[PDB]
Amino acid sequence: MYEQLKGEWNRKSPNLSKCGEELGRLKLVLLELNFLPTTGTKLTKQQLILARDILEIGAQWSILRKDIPSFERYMAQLKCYYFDYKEQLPESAYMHQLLGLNLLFLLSQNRVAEFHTELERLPAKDIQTNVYIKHPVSLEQYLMEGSYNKVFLAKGNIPAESYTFFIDILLDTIRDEIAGCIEKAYEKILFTEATRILFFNTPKKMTDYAKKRGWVLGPNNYYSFASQQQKPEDTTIPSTELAKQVIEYARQLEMIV
């Protein structure tokens, strides 16, 4: 009952005994009363203020500690708390920051289907104001237009934090597609093509593609492996299945008998 409301959160959180004490704090709130009917009665709305506040700080702790399955877990606890039948409990300022963390995490999961189906609960909070939501929908607009340069010039532009765990997964989900787009029937290119298709002036990153994949830098020349097969000759695979398709016609030109 009112146990460690604001501990070591404003400055640092190096300890892990805070996590179990918050976990015991997550026990006692759910041992008090269930949030399932949720009709009225501002008394039980007081403990809905506290329960949503101790998970938003639990979400900030979860993104700080490099934890992916918990950051979706504490957000799903909060997003089910925003799903209220009789929605009340007036405006918390951490709400617009929280949806920006969820939507950018959903953009980082390579979820383009889930990205757009979330964008209905904000009526006019996408264009007029709310840069926390405006920054991913500007970013997703940049990926659809085709400007990779505009993506990374805005990578050093964040409203609140550094968005560090979000841009690095965003850095991960682009380059493998760029590696997926260059691994084709291409035979060889020089270093200046990887200066344009890829990026920086000889970092350890090109070693990472050299140690994991190929792209062996020899006499200032990369070597990407490539081949092709040949198949117009097989009339035999449309021989068996076409014979099935012709008979199932003639099976069905009769037989309602």
């Binding site: 026990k27 759910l30 041992l31 269930n34 399932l36 399955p69 877990r73 504490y74 799903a76 606890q77 089910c80």
Partner: protein, 254 residues
């Protein structure tokens, strides 16, 4: 919401999840299908003692999807929480599948009396006889006698006709059911030979229907024994009648 809670490993949080599972399962539909997959793998290791609610809401969601066997495998696996319920639109449909699963099993097992029978759960027959007692206490015994023939069980058939409800009438409703409509002859004699049981030890000699049933069977020596008893007890009134019915109905070799 509940998916987040079932990703952790305290039984005090398992109790608060299942309390929300069985409460709003009519609203929370197949969104929970990822969570039930975590219920099913964690069903193999029970660990804690609240596996009954886990098997309960597993049936609740498989009914909404339409799975009927797995709704019944977890209806039997539920236990006391499943048995105590008798007033729901949900509980009445799954026992109707259970009797349907039971009566297609016994007719399957009726074709093989010689070994190789399927193993029968005690919990499926725990609600068969429980519903039979509901059929007895309702005082509508036509409901009781209908399942008692579809179950291929004879002593529950004997128990109904031995009861002092409507002793000639309900028994004659039972004979009219078996004499008019019948397709299988394997249990036809078994129903026939248990009819002539109740005419013997009831109160009184009524030796017109037993001779009628033994014409329908092949008992030459068992008619001649009770015809000797009619002469021995100095009863030539109905004995003169019953030999004409034996002459008129049966023709030759009997």
């Amino acid at each position: 919401g509940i998916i987040s809670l079932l990703d952790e490993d305290e039984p005090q949080l398992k109790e608060f999840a299942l309390h929300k599972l069985n409460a709003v399962v009519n609203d929370f539909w197949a969104e929970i299908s990822e969570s039930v997959d975590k219920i099913e793998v964690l069903y193999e290791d029970e660990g804690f003692r609240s596996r009954q609610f886990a098997a309960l809401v597993a049936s609740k969601v498989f009914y909404h999807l339409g799975a009927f066997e797995e709704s019944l495998n977890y209806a039997l696996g539920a236990g006391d929480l499943f048995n105590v319920n008798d007033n729901s639109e949900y509980v009445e449909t799954i026992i109707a599948k259970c009797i349907d699963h039971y009566t297609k099993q016994c007719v399957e097992n009726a074709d093989l009396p010689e070994g190789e029978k399927k193993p029968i759960d005690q919990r499926l027959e725990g609600i068969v006889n429980k519903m039979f007692q509901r059929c007895l206490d309702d005082h509508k015994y036509k409901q009781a006698i209908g399942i008692a023939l579809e179950t291929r069980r004879l002593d529950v058939f004997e128990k109904t006709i031995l009861e002092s409800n409507d002793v000639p009438g309900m028994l004659a409703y039972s004979l009219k059911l078996c004499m008019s409509l019948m397709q299988n002859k394997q249990f036809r004699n078994k129903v026939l030979r248990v009819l002539v049981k109740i005419y013997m030890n009831l109160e009184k000699p009524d030796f017109i229907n037993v001779c009628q049933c033994l014409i329908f069977l092949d008992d030459p020596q068992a008619v001649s024994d009770i015809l000797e008893k009619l002469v021995k007890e100095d009863n030539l009134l109905m004995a003169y009648q019953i030999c004409f019915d034996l002459y008129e109905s049966a023709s030759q070799q009997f």
